[PDB]
Scaffold this active site. Structure first.
Site, PDB file in Angstrom:
ATOM      1  CD  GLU A   1      60.325   6.990  49.521  1.00 37.70           C
ATOM      2  OE1 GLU A   1      59.771   6.018  49.031  1.00 37.70           O
ATOM      3  OE2 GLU A   1      60.172   8.020  49.204  1.00 37.70           O
TER       4      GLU A   1
ATOM      5  CE  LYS B   1      60.332   9.856  45.704  1.00 41.42           C
ATOM      6  NZ  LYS B   1      59.659   9.257  46.351  1.00 41.42           N
TER       7      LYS B   1
ATOM      8  CB  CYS C   1      60.418   5.647  46.009  1.00 47.15           C
ATOM      9  SG  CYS C   1      59.017   4.548  45.751  1.00 47.15           S
TER      10      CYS C   1
HETATM   11 CL   LIG Z   1      57.327  11.185  47.540  1.00 43.22          CL
END
Ligand SMILES: [Cl-]
Ligand SMILES: [Cl-]
Ligand SMILES: [Cl-]
Ligand SMILES: [Cl-]
Ligand SMILES: [Cl-]
Ligand SMILES: [Cl-]
EC number: 3.5.1.4
Lengths: 339, 339, 339, 339, 339, 339
Positions: free
Chosen positions: B59, B134, B166
């Site tokens: 990322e 995300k 993440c």
């Molecule tokens: Cl973020």
């Protein structure tokens, strides 16, 4: 959340976990006698650990595993019952709360249905304040009736406690459910046999972290004729760091103090890793900065959970396509498990 | 599922993860130039790793983190776009699939709303076959718009792949959702800054285990003016055992082969730790032995998930009682986050 | 090659290793009784581990170590014999293969020469299919007669097996010899006393790696009046990664599944770390590119092995210059060992 | 054999190993310039490490890897040559011995045959006292000509040294060969790329143990356009215990003192784990006690080594049945490697 | 005492430690420029770590090590001075306290005597509130003038802080002295070169434990022409458990929150491992039970400390009999160090 | 300083440490019988460990802990006495020195005052050559009378030995005091109960390092009705590196050889980490270079030690302000400990 001392303070709950040697028993009298060895062990431990407020024993630690169905039915306990009374008296005498295992607990339709696998939390007055029946039995090998509910109870010094059993802990959902009900300590009692040693030790830490909760694990030791149990009883901080951990030793003990104020401060003030909070306010900075309110988003974005709740049978069918259709597999057949 | 060699076979997918040094960039031209360094890196790696079928970057690895809002808006990518075309050409030239990071991806209402934080999976023909935005941004500090959906796509040699980003990975629900959609590899791309190093390394292993899935993690390295990133990119077996793991080194690489047949054999034939299967057939041995059918129980016994799905606002309210009511805290104030 | 489950599939062999508590015995009757405890343990373990196809016990696990020469001679076994018949019946009843230790096995010139230290592999029909006599006894302390041959046998599901004993494993040559004969699993049975704990655990992994072979180790536990044994029985992948490992606990068990197809795929398709292949085709890319054929070089470039094979006495003489000339040393004298 | 100090004594040799950042070079001038950076690094290190007697650099540390064949041929070194003279002057100025890498060293038939991959040991007078050409190149990817001989040389303070290169170390035979020639320190210089990190770190320790020898490893770091190198340079005791180990850091250094008297005392007086001695006196206590002489047995009992020495082509043929018949595999094809 | 989050609360002090890349500098202007890079780094870190109250940089991080005596004298700082003003402005702008290194600090008799090696603590108003000069320089190699005093200062939120430098920390006496003056956090700033990596990481934890104090360590990274520095900056709980630790990476950062109330509660209420308390009340239960008062014993029973305080020259003479008589040794001579 | 072999040489002392199972005893006869089991264990171990020169047993290993005051007084030993004679005979028969625990040793005013907690060193002729009484009892729980003196004695082969007990080792001062009296091996005998496992294992290594001394630790195992003991007996090099370590297993043994010449060479020739030397010559390079003599500085710069020696009551008062004023705390009350 601190490790090394035998004391406890008004802010800290002194927790002891026991690597209890798995019994190999066959009759009701043998169960009662072993119940009394546990009781004596509680009272002795208290003399060495003046800060102990909570003592935890493994799943199966009272009966052992009753591999024989008839012996299973013959030793199944009533709750409350004689075994719980023996434990209650020890908690009173030692001025401690405790967590004890009854395997089995008579079914409402005993002896026509399989017993439950049950844990009790007993307070320092000797009263049973939580009774938990295992929601996910360790099938195929083990044949208890499934429970259906988690609980949260006020524990020593007000620390909120939930109980779970062994195989339950493999499923992140249960730890989440307890923490979301407000649990501050999840206690996992297990009779966790080899093989899966390193994965279970890791799973307790990862669940402590993910759910911002204290975790205590008591696991059995020794060999009982069938299984060998790997110990590694432990107490873990809410930040995922181990406080203390046993090895594989028979009747090992660990002891740690967990702070009530520390976990409350954290759940109130943590930001980046306030996972309970974040899960239900997703994207809050993004929405604020995009002019869309200051709450983030709460809606559940995960189709699996939406399906499981709305249509459990469709969730089942979906999993069976990824795994298999029958509970048993012909490549590794087990008697009474169809394939 | 085997580690040490640079080869791959018709059964195994050769996966490389990259500890890519976090860029510190400010303009569109700088982004393009760094996109081309990534492209060159893919093509070079392929010469040393003839078995590589999938290469994974962290990322933020294309833009870095655009801390300045104006630079954020000015460099936000179109997908498909010039950056994706640069990556696509490398995947073709090297005959590999790849996973790349666009941060940001222009919002549908750009520049009136925050960009998404997005990953793309590009196949070895250069085509974008999954685009993931995300779902749980790393608030408070980071201000992307939340996505709302997971995906599963056929990958190299038919291996089923899902992407997550993440902070998403801190939440067991997302890994579950992907595996229940049939994912066999979950790829977690991160720009995971210190502090939480040991907990993130552990969480990837524990999620591989809990969801019986291969996991690949690519995490950034270096210091970018604000954060330092801790690397430890890794590839993990579905049994929770690490295949290989980097250290904190800049532009470290790990490489492992994951077997398609091994994970399918396991999901079909495993019994005690077939967690995907077990979760939806609870207590099967117990019910069989109690005369109640041979399917176990599928119903969801966890009140939190029942509530979250039925009444997201009540789930939110419940969490706020355990944590706090506002997204910000006055004890650690952050500009633009209310408390 | 996967760890955590109690099942096995048509591709995988379920291997259990036992941290068997070292017996302290003196007569033939005591040996027989302990043989029967092993037999019972096999049958019990099978009930908990339905995938078990191979069970492994430590060196000395049947007799203990017979420190007294007369007791040694009096308990030495015939193979086949009553002890092997007891084991054979357990393997049949439990439908498993097994590896058992006879220490001693009567010499052809019993009682005029020292017994062998022997392992047997028994199949699931109860037949002895390999008998291995230890090639390198743990001198000075232990006084068995040396064997002279390694073997490879078809095992469960066709997995090729070789057996080695304790001190043998300290010598990379023996693992090489077995793998080069086609072994896919080397089983190392030991009664490995403290001190050398961390070096032996490491040596099994390093030999698995170096010889691209599965390794299973069963090591004894407890204190027997003379030695304390450190356990850490383990099963290791052919890539050198541990599958599962016991601690020092008495009668610990580990269990793992090793894939037949995975090791065959690897030995066929691995390139950079195909060590069995590479050793006999050295410099292949170099020779191709220098116009000298496409086989690399096979010739043995190592003078020590050339000398050892041609002139064992000269190899001995050479080592004695680097070490010492007599089997004993006057700085640490031992009765009956000259210096 | 002791770690922590920067000093050395008349009994101890101060060894430094360097995690040298892999160069990415293309011309002869660039090689010369990098040779001079190494020289400066030697002289600087000596100011901080007054006990340093031996400094070790990784394989490829002078040229980098010359992936392009023309650049390979154009930069191939003469030995002795200008690069060695630059190194020699540093060893003189710093009063240290050193180990340096020439990759390639011109073949006798340059440029008609591939260069060797070579190490030199230079003494503190600047003289080349050992030249070692790699016996097992890291095929398939790397195309050097194979060497055919190991060497043992008197080193600083009389410590006996042998050199080996990277992939050589995967084969226990080479460490054995060196120790049996009398080596007391084996130095392994590598440019060991990811993936195989944990297995190589372990293999150095296991070879130190198995051959009762000190080991020093210098491994490269960084990313060079193709590979990333994992560092973990280390110095290991003859008892298999690490003295000190680097991490993955660029231009990391470790330093340890190895005792000349300690390894000589041990090789003279050790008994149970005197592996060099034991291998050539097998079963000595057994034979003594059976009336058959006091030397044990020396003969080689391992058919693989007997065959390899007598009939290398038959050993090759035997391995090809277990692995594959061609140097390449069609499942992972590589240009110029046939399958 | 909790790790993982970027926040801090009214009870917790947010501490960041920096693995700062060792500079290689030669002039005053270069020092000033590097001072400004540190200042920028403080301000950037604060944007990512809103809870940071204390930031810590390594010994030598401002000047590097000035190996050349003339450059040493030419760059020696005044305190307060231009370098401290640059740091002070960053602490104000970022609203944080900081710890910075001046090496050297001009001697009172500059340039006639060696400079000190000094640390400053700067508060969030920019004021210097502690100045510590290293009491035990890393002789022989390093030539600073020794300081003679430890200090304890009120820090952020009232947390009591003492500073120590590198080699100081090898001596348990200094940590004791600080804790006995009331320090609650000891900050150890180091430029700790390889070799002694694992022993220094361990020593910080063992000193945290032994003195019931929080510890923060900032250590340098990279190679500076002479030494390589091993990083592993860390923050440790008062119970000896690591909060977070860097690896060897350049400009790594760790961040943890230490609770003011937790350490005060513990020092008040701990019993078995209240080491500060126990040392001065020895044998209290014994004396009570023997009728001799309820204070235990306070007197110092250790002859070495009695001698060192009364007759430092006799303590010196005593040590010289166990070690050596001159500061240098002829077996490893160093210029300007006599032997 | 080397680990793995069972031998010892004229330079090395063979040390065995025993993880002795804690006895649960009540009468004098039971003590005598257990004394004889220890004696038998010494003689047996010697047969397996021909190099053993020193055997070490845990604190409490002879009596167990006598929790009952009357049983305490009734079993208290005379030294010399019947228990010591039993041990002496074993050391003679096995030709070894040994370290044994008497808890209690009758006070000079027995039974009017609490017994001491005592260790004896017995030589291989059976003579008691050191008697050490514990200086810092493990209060609050344990009620022995405090001793007041450390000792150094010539041991096997001239190795200088000091003894310390359990809780003593938590205090760096005692290890310093012994090393400064010339100890080359400090032996720490403990009955170290859970919780503090990882901190005690670490403290032994850190004290070996800090005081440049060999350390041997023997710690008890099992559960005795009150406490569980965690084993991990170990022998550590003077460089802080573990030689060998037990796990938690009952009656585990470790064995290592420590070199007399190695520690003497080091204490004479080490420079940067010659901590005993450095502490009393601080700043030597600095003073030389500033024209002020070549001895460094010896004076004690630490106010705590100056105060403790001059005015123990003021040191006590100072600590009580940081901790608490009474030996007990009302938040965790213990009978007979005032608060
Ligand atoms: Cl973020
Ligand atoms: Cl169950
Ligand atoms: Cl043997
Ligand atoms: Cl090569
Ligand atoms: Cl210094
Ligand atoms: Cl005590």
């Amino acid at each position: 959340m601190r490790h090394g001392d035998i004391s406890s303070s008004h802010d800290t709950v002194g927790i002891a976990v026991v690597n209890y040697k798995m019994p190999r028993l066959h009759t009701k009298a043998e169960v009662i006698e072993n119940a009394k060895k546990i009781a004596d062990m509680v009272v002795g431990m208290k003399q060495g650990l003046p800060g102990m407020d909570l003592v935890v024993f493994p799943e199966y630690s009272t009966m052992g595993i009753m591999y024989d169905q008839d012996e299973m039915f013959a030793t199944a306990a009533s709750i409350p019952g004689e075994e719980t009374a023996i434990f209650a008296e020890a908690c009173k005498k030692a001025d401690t709360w405790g967590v004890f295992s009854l395997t089995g607990e008579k079914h409402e339709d005993h002896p026509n249905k399989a017993p439950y696998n049950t844990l009790v939390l007993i307070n320092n007055k000797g009263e049973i304040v939580q009774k938990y029946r295992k929601i996910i039995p360790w099938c195929p090998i083990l044949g208890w009736y499934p429970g259906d509910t988690t609980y949260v109870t006020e524990g020593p010094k007000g620390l909120k406690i939930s109980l779970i059993v062994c195989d339950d802990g493999n499923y992140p959902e249960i730890w989440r459910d307890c923490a979301m009900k407000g649990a501050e300590l999840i206690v996992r009692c297990q009779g966790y046999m080899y093989p899966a040693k390193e994965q279970q030790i890791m799973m307790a830490k990862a669940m402590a972290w993910a759910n911002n909760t204290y975790v205590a694990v008591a696991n059995a030791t020794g060999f009982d004729g069938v299984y060998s149990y790997f110990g590694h009883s432990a107490i873990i901080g809410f930040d995922g760091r181990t406080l203390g951990e046993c090895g594989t030793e028979e009747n090992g003990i660990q002891y740690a103090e967990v702070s009530i104020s520390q976990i409350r401060d954290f759940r109130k003030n943590a930001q980046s890793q306030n996972h309970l909070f974040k899960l239900l306010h997703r994207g809050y900075t993004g929405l604020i900065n995009s002019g869309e309110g200051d709450r983030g988003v709460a809606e559940c974005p995960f189709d699996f959970y939406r399906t499981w709740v709305l249509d459990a049978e469709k969730a089942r069918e979906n999993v069976e396509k990824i795994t298999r259709s029958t509970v048993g597999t012909a490549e590794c057949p087990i008697q009474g498990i169809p394939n």
